[PDB]
Assembly symmetry: none
Homo-oligomer: 68 residues x 2
DNA sequence: CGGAGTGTGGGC
DNA sequence: GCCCACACTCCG
């Protein structure tokens, strides 16, 4: 998967939470974000490198997609 | 390429093939060949083929060597 | 060679 | 002992 708009980010950005199905890490989740283009981001600093000074991410909680 | 892999049984060979282009340019895929010449691309496929007959607990697929 | 899915280890 | 951040596998 479900791609969910992320209101804390600019228009068309979506957040997805994928539960790991197998191996040693099973049941833990990974959070991905997608750009309006469709590009996949897997961490906060990756997200900041792409967005730069268009969005203040200092207080942005990558996991929940909420500003704090 | 094709080199003799000593930590597997008589006549197994390892092969490494450098990736030529793209985002993973310069990384390598490792392949194995049994005495028949059936190609193996991963440790689960290899383990499935060999079964109980060869102990791959400690087998590191990339280097081709058993590790403590 | 890509890339979803799982492994990995430093910083905490 | 956890988890961020990214490296790696493994099969398409």
């Amino acid at each position: 998967g479900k791609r969910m708009d992320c209101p804390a980010l600019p228009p068309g950005w979506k957040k997805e939470e994928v539960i790991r199905k197998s191996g040693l890490s099973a049941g833990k989740s990974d959070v991905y974000y997608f750009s309006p283009s469709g590009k996949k981001f897997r961490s906060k600093p990756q997200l900041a490198r792409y967005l730069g000074n268009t969005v203040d991410l200092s207080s942005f909680d990558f996991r929940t997609g909420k500003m704090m």
